[PDB]
Write a protein that binds this ligand. Structure first.
Ligand code: SF4
Ligand code: O
Length: 753
């Protein structure tokens, strides 16, 4: 057909819209119905289109992804597991992005300089492993992984998996981009079929057009409030409707990005002209031209069935701000000042932060700059502290050039390195003591306890870049930009005009400096050195095979009550320093979960010594003494981030099974990958029948089978037993992972030794 290349760095890897078409076709003959946009792109990528059992929400699809992307906080451990496989080269186009380890303190190029010193050991590891197995490397400073992917690797009809839960951002350019854990990326780097549970499809119909202060963020802040953090589990959100064409291409990225906060498998928009337009401005107009030739397969079939439909009228949606400690608690910016007052949330804003992969684009910076110059014209500057993060070198270089970075600096903002920064708590923040109650408003996406500054009493609210700027100029949550009046230097009252700005540079993009480094695909005769006395990197030892017997007399490490995020299971911020060292990082295991016994964080009773103390230390004592343990959890356990450390770390400290009401998808797949048993209650009221002092026997592991549940004998200390039933979603692929010890120990047996 045509020979159009996947990117500017892989001139020999072509887009295969001919193969997408071939398979879409084979499949709609078996099914005889309209296919939605995500069914087309997902099923066009099946390993066996003719024989694959397709049932939404029931069957497991064996898929073939087109490329793998890694950020440096999860790449370390994906590559250390790749090194253990023994495979010589990655089998699909893969990238490493160094965005997570650059701490905010001084601003801009000072922090970058300091990050390169402090973390050299790590960047060195990734760079060398990169050159050796054929993975491209984007150096520190390059940008946040999702801006670099939308700018360079994302295209209509791509199936891309990334080791980061915000990978759905790519749906803004018509692809299926799905977040996974390091062991899932190893399968595809190694050449085996990837499995995904067939999703349901929620359709959102957009209507009207966005006006004034309303922007792309408000649509996903309202869908999160409506569907809640557990609403999208097991479904792809498919956007459609007449109002789609009024949203920019980076606006659509904003909305697919934050679909992660409702647990969606991903989100996607259909190929339209705003996408075409953006591909051409990012030098990929040949791709724009080929997607027009394949257009029918990049839009939904007429009359397709959604399992749920929601409709939003863009012309009626007004500004929103979500939180304080969940992103689905939605308020409008018009009563947030009253609900905080009533609810005892701090009213004065200490810091305002625009950035992160959800809101770091040229359009976001320009709409921001436009509230900022109105304030400047009347001689005002920020009452709050103001920080600004650019999405990539290219956005940074271009907003510098078009004048926006200096308006943002003249109102009183500091520009930080092109990196996550304060968003995974890599902030050296010093305006508050620890435990001081305060309010910070961000244009980010999550606002979980202690996530931005390790201070559990920080009240964080998420909103849009232009509203964070209005509220930072004012310093108070009691300020509606639409109604109220500021006071200038002049002596007069003025009101803010709604921001206006271009979706993309009038000129072409200024690309900044060279941050990419291609694999030498010649040399590769590098050794990767991991110091044997290193505190940041450590090679892995395999886990044990299953013994062939049931799990009698299991100790309960903790029964968790309430919300339990992977930011609670394995904290980030200062702990990012140990993302290549399993033993050292295992010392944050569960320190933020609330124990039901005493309502406290990191304080559990050691069964033997009967003293109360830290969760990691009690799990090490149980492991030292031979006691096999379990965790008991509530609903939507493992919510949030995709980091596999939350499943590797209970395996290293002796954990055996985790039992909950429900699981979040990516954490449940990561638990089965590492040899653990994720199990749910067949009746959720049984959670109330298990007390912290009971012992549990999981039984019938010997004839473990898909569809057949497991029995759990709850041994109460008085001599009262009780049998309850536990369901699992394992298919037979997955049961071989468990019997072997981990997915990786299974993969190594298959290499004929
Ligand atoms: S959500 Fe924050 S930490 Fe996770 S990728 Fe986006 S900017 Fe980086
Ligand atoms: O993320």
């Amino acid at each position: 057909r045509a020979k159009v290349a996947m990117s500017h760095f892989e001139p020999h890897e072509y887009i295969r819209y001919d193969l997408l078409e071939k398979n879409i076709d084979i499949v709609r003959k078996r099914l005889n119905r309209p296919l939605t946009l995500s069914e087309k792109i997902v099923y066009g990528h099946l390993d066996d289109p003719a024989n694959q059992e397709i049932e939404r929400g029931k069957t497991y699809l064996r898929l073939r992804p087109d490329r793998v992307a890694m950020q440096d906080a999860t790449a370390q451990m994906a590559m250390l597991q790749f090194i253990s496989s023994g495979l010589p080269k990655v089998a699909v186009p893969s990238t490493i992005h160094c965005d997570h380890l650059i701490e905010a303190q001084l601003g801009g190029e000072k922090d970058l300089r300091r990050a390169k010193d402090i973390n050299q050991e790590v960047y060195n590891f990734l760079a060398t492993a990169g050159a050796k197995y054929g993975v491209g490397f984007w150096r520190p400073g390059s940008g946040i992984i999702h801006q670099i992917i939308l700018e360079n690797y994302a295209y209509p009809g791509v199936l891309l998996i990334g080791t980061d839960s915000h990978t759905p951002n790519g749906g803004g350019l018509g692809g299926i981009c799905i977040g996974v854990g390091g062991a899932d990326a190893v399968d595809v780097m190694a050449g085996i079929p990837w499995e995904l549970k067939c999703p349901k499809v929620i359709g959102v119909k957009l209507t009207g057009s966005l006006s004034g202060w309303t922007s792309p963020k408000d649509v996903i802040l309202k869908v999160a409030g409506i569907l809640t953090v557990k609403g999208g589990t097991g479904a792809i959100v498919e956007y459609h409707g007449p109002g789609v064409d009024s949203i920019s291409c980076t606006g659509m990225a904003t909305i697919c990005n934050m679909g992660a906060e409702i647990g969606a498998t991903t989100s996607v928009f259909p190929y339209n002209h705003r996408m075409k337009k953006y591909l051409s401005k990012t030098g990929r107009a040949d791709i724009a031209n080929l997607a027009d030739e394949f257009k029918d397969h990049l839009v939904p079939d007429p009359g397709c069935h959604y399992d749920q439909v929601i409709e939003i009228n863009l012309s009626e949606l007004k500004p929103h701000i979500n939180g304080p400690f969940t992103p689905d608690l939605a308020h409008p910016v018009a009563e947030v000042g009253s609900v905080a007052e009533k609810e005892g949330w701090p009213l004065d804003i200490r810091v305002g932060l625009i950035g992160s992969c959800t809101n770091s684009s040229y359009e976001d910076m320009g709409r921001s700059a436009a509230v900022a110059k109105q304030a400047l014209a009347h001689g005002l500057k920020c009452k709050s502290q103001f920080t600004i993060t650019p999405g990539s070198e290219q956005i940074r270089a271009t907003i510098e050039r078009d004048g926006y970075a200096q308006v943002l600096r003249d109102v009183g903002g500091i520009v930080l390195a092109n990196a996550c920064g304060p968003c995974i708590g890599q902030w050296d923040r010093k305006d508050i003591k620890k435990g001081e109650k305060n309010t910070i408003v961000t244009s980010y996406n999550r606002n979980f306890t202690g996530r931005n500054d390790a201070n559990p009493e920080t009240h964080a609210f998420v909103t849009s870049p232009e509203i964070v700027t209005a509220l930072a100029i004012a310093g108070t949550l009691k300020f509606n930009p639409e109604t109220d009046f500021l006071t200038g230097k002049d002596g007069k009252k003025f009101k803010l005009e709604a921001p206006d700005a271009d979706e993309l540079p009038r000129a072409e993009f200024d690309p900044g400096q060279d941050t990419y480094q291609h694999p030498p695909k010649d040399s590769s005769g590098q050794r990767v050195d991991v110091s044997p006395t290193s505190q940041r990197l450590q090679l892995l030892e395999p886990f044990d095979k299953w013994d062939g017997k049931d799990l009698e007399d299991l100790q309960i490490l903790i029964k968790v009550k309430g919300k339990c995020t992977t930011d609670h299971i394995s904290a980030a911020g200062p702990w990012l320093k140990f993302r290549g060292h399993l033993d050292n990082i295992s010392n944050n295991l569960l320190i933020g979960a609330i124990n039901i016994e005493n309502r406290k964080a990191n304080s559990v009773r050691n069964a033997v010594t009967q003293e109360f103390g830290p969760v990691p230390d009690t799990a090490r004592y149980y492991k030292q003494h031979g006691i096999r343990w379990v965790v008991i959890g509530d609903e939507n356990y493992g919510e949030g981030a995709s980091r596999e450390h939350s499943a590797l770390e209970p395996r290293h400290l002796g954990g055996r099974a985790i039992i909950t009401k429900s699981f979040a998808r990516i954490h449940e797949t990561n638990l089965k990958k590492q040899g653990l048993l994720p199990l749910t209650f067949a009746d959720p009221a049984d959670y109330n029948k298990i007390h912290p002092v009971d012992k549990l026997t999981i039984q019938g592991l010997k004839d473990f089978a898909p569809g057949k549940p497991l029995k759990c004998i709850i041994k109460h200390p008085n001599g009262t037993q009780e049998t309850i039933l536990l369901n699992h979603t394992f298919n037979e692929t997955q049961i071989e992972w468990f019997r072997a010890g981990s997915a990786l120990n299974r993969m190594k047996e298959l290499q004929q030794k």
